[PDB]
Design a protein around this ligand. Structure first.
Ligand SMILES: Nc1ncnc2c1ncn2[C@@H]1O[C@H](COP(=O)(O)OP(=O)(O)O)[C@@H](O)[C@H]1O
Lengths: 50, 50, 48, 195
């Protein structure tokens, strides 16, 4: 898999972080780290993924 | 000198049509305190249903 | 990718970190982890 | 010589522009005619960027801005429709009237004939947010001038011979009713916290 992953981080800008503050249901400050090799977002229904 | 003369109506301006949408309500300001809290929210440790 | 706990086995093979978002009352919290750390968490759960 | 718009339609359009609304309750002849010729009134108003919205349930017609469908401008601006921001007391009174109207509709149904409300009933409620200015002669006068100001916008009728008013249908179509709820509850919480 990593043989193809060399494209990421080398050629193009990759989203590696999102930070929220009192956005939607996220009170206070929050932050999610995005792995440069691809990230999944999981959680039960109605948990704030969207 | 407050009689009303029979001069015509010319330059009759039509303005201020009372559309109900045009109303906006009072913006009472709040100045009691500030919401400085931006703690890391370390309570996010994983504890999810089976 | 976004997914409500579906196709978890498929995501595990083509991504290297998951963002577990869970709800509690009116507040929502998100924690970012690697697949392997979550595997260790599941192993701790396995003692139940 | 040349064709002229029907006299009744011209009268209805001029009235609708002057007062901003028609009602079957107090102007049946014009209101019915407008509903029987919607394509004529909408054609008459379109050159001015005005357009009638009709509320058949409550028997009401009201003008509204006909500007483009969500253009690059996120908020509309119109030459003739001059926008206003009601002062604090007017906002409180409108919020009280709005919640009274919604509460009544919850029971009797949408568009039910509004129950007449006495002046004496509202002063205790305005007192909850404005205190006592110093005398009954002052508070009653203030309430009366506020009601007369609101009647200009068409939200309430004039106090009848027995000092009761009726809430007009137009209150349901305010721009942002969520604002009334928020400010009203916020001030209520303020007084409850300070007491
Ligand atoms: N602006 C909003 N409008 C309506 N509901 C909202 C809003 N913001 C948050 N919600 C609530 O918070 C959650 C927002 O949707 P979300 O949980 O992100 O969808 P998903 O299940 O795909 O993650 C929902 O539980 C919803 O009930």
């Amino acid at each position: 898999m990593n043989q193809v992953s060399g494209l990421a981080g080398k050629e193009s800008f990759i989203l590696t972080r999102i930070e929220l503050f009192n956005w939607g249901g996220f009170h206070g400050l929050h932050q999610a780290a995005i792995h440069q090799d691809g990230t999944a977002v999981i959680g039960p229904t109605g948990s704030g993924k969207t | 000198r407050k009689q009303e003369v029979p001069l015509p109506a010319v330059g009759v301006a039509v303005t201020g049509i009372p559309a109900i949408e045009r109303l906006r309500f009072k913006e009472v300001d709040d100045e009691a305190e500030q919401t400085l809290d931006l703690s890391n929210h370390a309570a996010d440790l994983t504890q999810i249903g089976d | 990718f976004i997914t409500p706990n579906k196709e978890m086995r498929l995501l595990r093979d083509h991504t290297r970190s998951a963002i577990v978002v869970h709800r509690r009352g009116q507040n929502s919290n998100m924690a970012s982890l690697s697949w392997e750390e979550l595997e260790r968490h599941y192993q701790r759960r396995g003692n139940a | 010589s040349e064709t002229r718009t029907l006299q009744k339609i011209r009268e209805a359009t001029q009235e609708l522009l002057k007062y901003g609304l028609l009602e079957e309750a107090s102007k049946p002849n014009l209101y019915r005619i407008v509903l029987s010729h919607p394509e004529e009134v909408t054609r008459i108003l379109e050159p001015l960027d005005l357009d009638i919205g009709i509320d058949e349930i409550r028997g009401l017609l009201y003008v509204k801005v006909r500007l483009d469908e969500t253009p690059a401008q996120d908020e509309w601006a119109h030459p003739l429709v001059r926008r206003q921001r009601l002062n604090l007391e007017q906002s409180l009174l409108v919020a009280i009237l709005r919640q009274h109207f919604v509460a009544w509709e919850q029971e009797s149904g949408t568009g039910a004939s509004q129950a007449q409300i006495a002046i004496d009933d509202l002063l205790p409620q305005l007192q909850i947010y404005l205190g006592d200015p110093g005398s009954e002669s002052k508070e009653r006068t203030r309430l009366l001038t506020l009601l007369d100001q609101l009647k200009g916008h068409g939200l309430v009728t004039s106090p009848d011979a027995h000092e009761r008013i009726v809430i007009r249908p137009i209150i349901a179509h305010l721009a942002d009713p969520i604002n009334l709820q928020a400010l009203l509850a916020w001030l209520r919480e303020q007084i409850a916290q300070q007491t």
